[PDB]
C-alpha cells in the first residue's frame, strides 16, 4: 500500500507544502509501523522546509519529529507491543504521514485520559525538555532555569518539567500573551523581549545571583544578554540557532568569568542507543505525570494534515503557544 | 615577626617584582601555617603582575598559586597534621613568600621520594590539570584529549594525568623542543601551532572523529580550530585566555553542529569546599602515583625567590616547559 503523507517538492516557504500518496514503509528489524493519528508541528519542520535542515541520515525525508497513533505491524525481533496499542513516538522524521516505523524503544504509552492528539504533542517538545534540563543541563532542586522560547512547544514543556524537577522557570517570549500562558503553566517570571531586556530582569528576578540553566534556542542575538545573566557554574544549553549562530565579542572571557558551561544539545541527530535512554529515562520518569503535580500537554491549534500548509504559515507567525498538532486521516 | 616575599608595588612587567619584608600571616580558625621551602611560577602571577589578574577575594595579594613547605604553626580547630610535618598546598595567592597560611584540608603530603622544590611544582599544575580532565571535561578512556599549551605546568601534568586516565593525550605548542618533551611525558602526538594548523592534524591523527576533550587556555585565536577538531559530544574545556577572549563567527552554529560543550574552569576563585573536595579527590586519586605509570613533577628552572624577577621574564618568554620553581631562604 501507498498512504498520504506531507509532502513538499522543493524547499521554500509553507506554499510548497502539500498532502501527496507516497511509499507506506515496512518495519525493519525491531521497529513498528505505527498508524499515525497525529503528528505536532516543529520548528525543525520549518527549517527543513526551508531546505536549512536536511533530516538526520536513515530518517525519512517527510516532516514530523513525533507521532501518536496505533501500533500497526510489528517488525521482526520485536520484545512488548501489540498491534492496535496506542503509542507516541519521538521520530526522526516521517511522523506528518499515515504511517511510520518506530524502534519499539521509542513508543511511549498514551498517557491514560490523553487523546492521541494530546500525546502528539508530547514526544518531542517534552524529550527535548527533559533532555534538556536533566541529561544535559542537570536542573537541579532550587536551579533558576531561563527558558527562552518559553511558550515554544518545548518552552511550555520546559516550564512544567523545571517545576517537576523542583526549579524555578524564567521564561522570555515576544507576547504579552505568551507570558501570561507561560505564567498559567508554571514560570515564576517572564520577561518579554521585545519590551525589556530580559538578562536585567532576570538578574533581578534572581537577586543578582543569575540563572544557574539557561535553555537557548535563539543563541547568538541572546547571547550577551545570557551569558551576563548566568549564574557561577551556569550551565547554558544552547539547542537552537533562531537569533543566529554568530557570536561577536568576548563570549570566552564572560563565560570564563562565569564559569559558564555553553553546553550544546541536538537530539534529532543522536543515535538510538541514546534515545532509547532517553525514553526509557523520560518514560520511567516522566511520562506517569501526564496522567496523576500533573503535566500538561499544550496545544494552540489542530489542524487536519491537509491544512500542513496553513500550520507551518501560522507557526512561521510564531502564534502558537505551545503545540500546533495535526490530525492525520485514518 | 615579618618574612621575606616576592612583591610587585605597581602592576606592569617583571621589573617591578622585589622581595619585600612583609607581615607574617597568622593561622585563622582550621588553617597551618606553612614555612614555604619552595613555590612555583603559574602564568596567573605573569598576569596579577600585569594587574589583569586581581587575586581572589579573601586570597592574600601576593604572589604564589602553590608552595611546598613544612607546617610551620596551627590554626584553631585541626583536624591530622603536626608542626614540622612538610607538605605542599594549592593556595589562592600568597606562596611565593616565607610563610603561608593554608586550611589544612589543602595541604598534601609531599609523596615520598619528592623534594620540597619538585613538590611545589605540582599543587596548581597538576590540580588543574586533574580538575580538567575529570571533574570538568570527565576524560574516560579512549579519549583523545587535545592540551593546548602542552608544556605549560597544567600542559605536563595533563599529559601525564590524560594517559593515566587511560586517554590519548595530544598536545600543541610553538617548539620543535617542546613538543619533543610534551612526547617523552606521554603526548601520542604534538602539532606546532607556529609550524602548522593543529586542527587539520588533529582530525588527521583521530581519522577525522576529532577529539572528545580540548583542554584550551587559549581561546579566541584557536577558537575556529578548536571547534573544527572538536568531536561530536566533545568537552572543549576553556581555562585561559591566552589567545584572547573575543569571538568572531559562528561559534555556536559550529559548536551546536558538533554537540560540542564549552565547559570554562577556573580554580583560582573556587571556594574552601570546592578545592578540599578536589584535593581530596586529587590525594585519593593521583597523588599516591608521584611514588609509584609513576607521575613526574616536570621542573624546568630554579631560581632562589630573589630572582623572581628573572623567573617571571623567563616565563613571559615562553622558554619553560613545565613547572619554573622558586626556592625561599629558610
Ligand atoms: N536541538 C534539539 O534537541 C531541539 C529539539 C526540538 C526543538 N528545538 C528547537 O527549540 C526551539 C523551539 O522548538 P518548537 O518547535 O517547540 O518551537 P515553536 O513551536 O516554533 O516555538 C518557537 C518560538 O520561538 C520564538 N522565537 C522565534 N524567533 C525568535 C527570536 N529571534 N528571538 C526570540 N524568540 C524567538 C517564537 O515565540 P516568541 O518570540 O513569541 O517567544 C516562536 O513561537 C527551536 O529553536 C527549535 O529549533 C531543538
Ligand atoms: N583557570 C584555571 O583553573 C587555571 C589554573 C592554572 C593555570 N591556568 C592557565 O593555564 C595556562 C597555562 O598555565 P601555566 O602557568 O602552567 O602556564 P606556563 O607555565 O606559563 O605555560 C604556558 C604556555 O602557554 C603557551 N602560549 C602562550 N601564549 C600562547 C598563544 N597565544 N598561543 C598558543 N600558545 C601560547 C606558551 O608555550 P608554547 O607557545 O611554546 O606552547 C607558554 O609557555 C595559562 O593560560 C594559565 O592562565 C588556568
Redesign the pocket.
Known sequence: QSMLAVHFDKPGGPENLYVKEVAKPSPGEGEVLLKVAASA????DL?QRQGQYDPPPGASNILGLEASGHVAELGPGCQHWKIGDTAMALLPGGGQAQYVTVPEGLLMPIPEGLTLTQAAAIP??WL?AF?LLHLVGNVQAGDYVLI????????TAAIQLTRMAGAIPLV????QK?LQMAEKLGAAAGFN?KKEDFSEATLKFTKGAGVNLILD??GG??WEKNVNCLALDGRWVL??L??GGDINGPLFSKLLFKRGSLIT????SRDNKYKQMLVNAFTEQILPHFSTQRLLPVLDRIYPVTEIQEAHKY?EA?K?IG??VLELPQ
Not at 148 to 155: F, Y
Open positions: 508541528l516543529n520548528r525543525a527549517m518531542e517538545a527535548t533532555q527562552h522560547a518559553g511558550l515554544s512547544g518545548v518552552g522570555t517570549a515576544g507576547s505568551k523581549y534556542c535563539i542575538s541572546y539547542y537552537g533562531m537569533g544539545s541536538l537530539l534529532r507557526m510564531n502558537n503545540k500546533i
